[PDB]
Amino acid sequence: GFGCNGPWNEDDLRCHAHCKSIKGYKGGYCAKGGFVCKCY
User: Fold this and answer.
1) Which residues are annotated as a binding site?
2) DSSP helix/strand/coil, 38
3) Which three-class secondary structure state does DSSP give residue 3?
4) DSSP category for residue 22
5) Residue 29 half-sphere exposure, CB side, CA atoms within 13 Å?
6) Number of domains comprising the chain
7) Domain of life, per the record?
8) Parent domain of 13
9) I need a surface site. Which of 1, 3, 14, 16 has the fewest CB within 10 A?
């Protein structure tokens, strides 16, 4: 994962960091119990 490893490890800031690092995205957040790094 990219920061999102469940409610026991919710590095949302890291998911946003990841997605932001990819030109085209604005950010990212940990969805599905914080198991999925969803970029937007």
Assistant:
1) 2-4, 12, 18, 29, 31, 33, 37-38
2) strand
3) coil
4) S
5) 4
6) 1
7) Eukaryota
8) 1-40
9) 1
